[PDB]
Each structure stands twice: as structure tokens, then as C-alpha cells.
Swiss-Prot record:
It is found in: Mitochondrion intermembrane space. It comes from Homo sapiens (Human). The modification Phosphoserine is found at S42. This is Sulfite oxidase, mitochondrial. Homodimer.
Amino acid sequence: STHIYTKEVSSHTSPETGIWVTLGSEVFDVTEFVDLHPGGPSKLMLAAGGPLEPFWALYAVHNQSHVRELLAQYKIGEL
Ligand code: HEM
């Protein structure tokens, strides 16, 4: 089974709501990670409420197995 969310995810851009992102068709609630993001949370927050792809494309440091499995710990469902 799968918890399915619509892209309209876009409302989850703060702690009060939860900070969510997508990667592929997967949805992640990354609220508890953000302050630990390398260089700080503000860069990560550029992607809040939407897909990581347009941002991660410029930052190939995310293209590591450990990063992908780290993100997977925050999965909540799918689009
Ligand atoms: C939920 C989203 C994100 C997660 C889970 C994530 C996770 C990570 C992790 C684990 C690293 C360190 C990798 C390593 O050095 O081995 C990293 C580094 C970095 N991330 Fe992200 N990232 C996210 C979003 C973003 C976004 C949206 C941007 C850009 C707009 C970004 C820019 C960077 C940069 C610049 C670094 C390098 C920092 C440094 O070494 O100074 N990240 N990220």
C-alpha cells in the first residue's frame, strides 16, 4: 500500500506545517533534518514544498548512496 499525496506537498514549507520535498514520485517530510543540512538549512529551504531535482542537478555532492538512503529515512508517501 502507499500513502498518496497531491503536488498541491506545496503547502508544506514550514515547521508548523512540516517541511516536505519530493524526489521522483516519492514524498519526504524532512522537518527534523533541515537544521543539520551541511552549510545550513537556508539552501535546503529553496526546495521546500517541491521537487529536489531542479536544485540537486547543480549539486552533484547529493549523488552518493549515503545521501539517497539518508533522504529515504524521511519518506512519507508518494505522488
Ligand atoms: C531534503 C533535501 C536535502 C537533503 C537531504 C540534502 C542532504 C545533503 C547532505 C547529506 C549533504 C552532504 C553530503 C556529503 O558531503 O557527503 C549535502 C550537502 C550540500 N547540499 Fe544538500 N540536501 C538537501 C537539499 C539541498 C538543496 C535544495 C540544495 C541547494 C539549493 C543543497 C545544497 C547543498 C550544498 C551546497 C551542499 C554542500 C555543503 C558543503 O560541503 O559545504 N542541498 N546535502
